[PDB]
TrEMBL record, chain A:
Taxon lineage: Eukaryota, Viridiplantae, Streptophyta, Embryophyta, Tracheophyta
Residues binding Zn(2+), per UniProt: 20, 22, 31, 34
Organism for this UniProt entry: Sinapis alba
Entry similarity comment: Belongs to the RNA polymerase beta' chain family. RpoC1 subfamily.
Protein's recorded name: DNA-directed RNA polymerase subunit beta'
Gene label: rpoC1
Oligomer status and interactors: In plastids the minimal PEP RNA polymerase catalytic core is composed of four subunits: alpha, beta, beta', and beta''. When a (nuclear-encoded) sigma factor is associated with the core the holoenzyme is formed, which can initiate transcription.
Protein role: DNA-dependent RNA polymerase catalyzes the transcription of DNA into RNA using the four ribonucleoside triphosphates as substrates.
Cell compartments where the protein resides: Plastid, Chloroplast
Automatic annotation (TrEMBL), chain C:
Record's subcellular location: Plastid, Chloroplast
Organism this protein belongs to: Sinapis alba
Signal peptide residues on this chain, from the entry's feature table: none
Its job: DNA-dependent RNA polymerase catalyzes the transcription of DNA into RNA using the four ribonucleoside triphosphates as substrates.
Name this polypeptide is given: DNA-directed RNA polymerase subunit beta
Domain of life of the organism encoding this protein: Eukaryota
Subunit relationships: In plastids the minimal PEP RNA polymerase catalytic core is composed of four subunits: alpha, beta, beta', and beta''. When a (nuclear-encoded) sigma factor is associated with the core the holoenzyme is formed, which can initiate transcription.
Family note: Belongs to the RNA polymerase beta chain family.
Full protein stretch here: 1038 to 1072 of 1072
Segments passing through the bilayer: none
Amino acid sequence: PEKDGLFCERIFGPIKSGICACGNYRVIKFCEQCGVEFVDSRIRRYQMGYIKLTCPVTHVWYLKRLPSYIANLLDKPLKELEGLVYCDFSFARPITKKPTFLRLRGSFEYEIQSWKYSIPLFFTTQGFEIFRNREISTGAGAIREQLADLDLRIIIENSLVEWKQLGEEDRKIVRRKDFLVRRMELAKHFIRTNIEPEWMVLCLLPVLPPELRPDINELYRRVIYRNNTLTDLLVMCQEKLVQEAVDTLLDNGI
Amino acid sequence: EVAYATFENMEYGEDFMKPDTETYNWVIQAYTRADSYDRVQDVAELLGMMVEDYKRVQPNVKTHALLVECFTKYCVVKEAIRHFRALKNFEGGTKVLHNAGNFEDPLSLYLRALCREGRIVELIDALDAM
Amino acid sequence: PESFRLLVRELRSLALELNHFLVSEKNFQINRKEV
Amino acid sequence: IVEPKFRLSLAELLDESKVVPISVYGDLDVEITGIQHDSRGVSSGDLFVCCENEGDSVLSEADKRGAVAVVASKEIDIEDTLGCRALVIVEDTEAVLAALASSFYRHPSKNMAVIGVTGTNGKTTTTYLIKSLYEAMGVRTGMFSTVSCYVHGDNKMDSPTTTSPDAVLVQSMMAKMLHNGTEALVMEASPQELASGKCDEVDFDIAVFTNLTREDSDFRGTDEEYRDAEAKLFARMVDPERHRKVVNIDDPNAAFFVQQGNPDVPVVTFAMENTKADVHPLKFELSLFETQVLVNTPQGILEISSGLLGRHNIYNILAAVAVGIAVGAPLEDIVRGVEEVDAVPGRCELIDEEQAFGVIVDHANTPDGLSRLLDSVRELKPRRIITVIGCAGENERGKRPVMTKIATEKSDVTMLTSDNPGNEDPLDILDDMLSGIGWTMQEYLKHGEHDYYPPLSNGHRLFLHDVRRVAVRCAVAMGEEGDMVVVAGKGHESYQLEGDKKEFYDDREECREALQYVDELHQAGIDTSEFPWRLPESH
């Protein structure tokens, strides 16, 4: 097994009970030369690993499976939200809990011209990177900032008043009413549980134990390969490759 | 769910095991002070079961104080007002609802919810009871 | 059981955790089973 | 710069300094190559002086670093804890400290002309002006200032970042100037330094008094003690043939100082409003970029065009003129020296990049310092005043609402920002500042969502940003023709403390660099008249 690989004995345990990577044997805690824990080899059926993603990726279950959970919680159409993940789009003003000074808002299909040369030069590149991902962001990371900054109690009150207004006033009004009830139902469950909505965007990728993957291994290799490529560059096209590969691993055919 | 399992043992048992008013109060109180999840539907169904048992079971002061506390917490204010009116006729009354300031002071929450919703005429009547 | 322990790991691959808790009927203490 | 080398025995150092020890242990013939009072600065061969406020761990640190003899006020067990070859017990370590430093460095102040400037205001700019005045006469002049220390000319010393140099340090650097050829020196004589006795062993030649206002909240004493502390410099005005006095007679106190010392010492009086002064202006013109003053002097009239701003800087010019008058300096040297100084760092320092609005960087970080600064800017008659201000974190929590009320009532546009957060969250300090006008961070952020920040009750504008680099440059971009942008708080300091690391940050550089690139931002279609900016691709 290759060191620090998908079958590494640092991460998942020995392939032989009581036998280390170097070959030292002990009767059934860590080897000084290699670091293998001297335990039964059965731990490879239950020991998890993880991949540290250089860029966050959305969980395909909560974005693409209709009706979308992320799109319903953010009250944005999946079309305008899918391009933020798989297209060359950018979202302005992702957050609302920190000071900002630009009048940009919404999704920009193109790129801001002044944001490319004038603004980075005026504030210097080092000083620009600090507040850059507060006025306009891109990728699944922009979605995570929106989810993390959501005021779930504001969602309930805004949905309720909008719901009542439509009642005072044919296939769209009914459909919009069902959207609002789903959104306020979703917000309520987050409030009374310990689930954070920002966990719908993955920062780390858990890895199945090796004994359960003696297809999945190739999909893991693709995610590691592109994720290692992306950290070497540090681009947006490479982020799409990492995000798409994780979508394939989690749920293909979507 | 622990208290509700015992209640079901009694509700669907023999005659000598049937719930009394105190039995309903304990199960209602268990749901009102639950740590997680929405329990307002469980309380409202228990209330309907208690009402269906009217020939044998009648409320007391604790029943209305618990129901005012539950509906106030979930902001079902119009139902908290109905049960506060019944609570006024019981001596002691608002003191039981105050719970000595424990469990986030249900007496103050009822007053705050009335103020936040512009139900001032009800709010004054609450102060008279106090 | 191996059928259920293996299920938990496959669910963990999708960033879901499946915990089994026992609530004691005597003292109401919650015990997390080793799964 | 050449480092002087001093070698004195312990017995000689005590004999020269006239310090009478309570008891002496060890060897008195131990050679001393240095004197230190802070243990972290003690080197091998240094004499350590232990102040009463430093514990037993300090003594071990000095011994570990190579201290050969120790001076302290209390008996210390040498035989088991200290490897030092000698120990000296004295009644008062702080008072002896000044005498030991002067004796070790051989009283260098006796070989130069020493000019001390005292007062609450104008010490640093007058010291900068007078040093240029002495240099215009060809005298190699050093300087001791809160901002900088020079041996002569442009030869800057790497001064430690201490707001009040110790008695040992003052003597230590002073001899270094002598070894390098310095003939005259100008030092700030702050009340705290004079009260603490750090400058007790300095042979001042000329004493200059500027003004006295109760501003320094850091002074641990009464107003009379604050006044008498500054009188210590004037008390030493003894020799009529060698000493001179320069007093500002506009201050009501000035009579008290004139009576200090020998009354026979000559006194030269300067005043902006009192025409009875020896040196006083006849007419002056104030603008955003320069001041022009016609000053009447006992030796004639002078014409001065200075880059210094504000009428408070006219006093500093007059004091430099009177000192030049007192030393009988050539009138032409008076004009050239004053006009040579353009920007004392952090003291209303004008940042000039050939633009239509003035940009000044000041060190004002107090409610009364900011009030005085903004009233001096208003008299220059700008169309608008734009102030960038912040508050330090974990300390001075009482001035946060006060400084916002002052800025919003005297500045047309106020930009709050971060001054030195430390371990406190910058948005928490800004919330404390916002409370002084009745706002909260949540309300300000709500206005940001609606992309519109309303003005205040008085019609002024308040904006906010927790990144100092962003807030400083965005305020320069709000400048128009005939405005003034005031970047207060830091002044000449070159660090922004975030957490525990002191990241390098200069306010002067940010204003300088923002002025260069503000042109390309405006032609790119960006409207930076206020917050938020209007990009061409935003509606």
